[PDB]
Amino acid sequence: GHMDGGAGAAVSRALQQCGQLQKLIDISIGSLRGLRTKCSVSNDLTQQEIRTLEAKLVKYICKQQQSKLSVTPSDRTAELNSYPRFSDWLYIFNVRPEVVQEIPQELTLDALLEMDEAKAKEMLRRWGASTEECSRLQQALTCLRKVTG
């Protein structure tokens, strides 16, 4: 409710970065994409760069619920309403993609951000998140609803 209401010339700041640029999300995530599989790196400072890239990526994927203050959440686009993509979201903190593959296709982050934290904990725990694993996740999933907006 602060300049949002019409995603016209304001949508560009959420939409160019939705796909057109694809450097911010992909290139930053490529670094962790490598790290998720290849953890033998001789470059310590890059482990820290990657650490930044991960946290930074949340600002790119969840910007559409944060920067929705300029781009109406009721407008954005179907694509912008599909963000943050669970696949491109859980990969940032590792929310066990092993577990997310057990989730029914109708239920996605779309519905996860929609559910209660207590409820989500029990959902995740029913998909393979093994109790403490879920708690580790919950603390990171909460970042979504704490990304401002």
The 3-state secondary structure of 16-58 reads: HHHHHCCCCCHHHHHHHHHHHHCCCCCCHHHHHHHHHHHHHHH
Q: Give the count of domains, the chain.
A: 2
Alpha-carbon span 31 to 112, nearest angstrom: 26
User: Among residues 22, 43, 78, which one ends one of the domains?
Assistant: 78
| Helix ranges, the chain (H) | 12-15, 26-37, 44-61, 90-93, 97-100, 109-112, 117-125, 132-141
Task: Give helix 132-141 / helix 117-125 axis angle, nearest 10°.
Answer: 140
Same domain assignment for residues 41 and 71: yes
Query: Per this entry, what is the length of the chain?
Result: 149
Establish how many alpha carbons lie within 13 A of residue 53's alpha carbon, considering only the half-sphere containing its beta carbon.
20
Task: Name the residue range of residue 16's domain.
Answer: 1-78
For residue 1, the tally of other CB atoms under 10 A from its CB is: 6
Comparing C-alpha atoms, which of 129, 48, 60, 124 is closest to residue 89?
60
Q: What are phi and psi of 39, to 5 degrees?
A: -100, 5
Confirm if 46 and 130 have CB atoms less than 8 A apart: no
The letter for the amino acid at 12 is S
Q: How many CB atoms lie within 10 A of CB 13?
A: 14
Q: For the chain, how long is the longest CA-to-CA vector?
A: 49
Give whole-number Cα distances, 18 to 39, 63, 111, in Å: 28, 9, 20
Q: Do 63 and 94 fall into the same domain?
A: no
| Rounded Cα–Cα distance for residues 127 and 123 (Å) | 7
Q: Write down which residue in 60, 78, 96 finishes a domain.
A: 78
* Shared-domain flag, residues 74 and 98: no
Q: Which two tokens stand for residue 114?
A: 């929609």
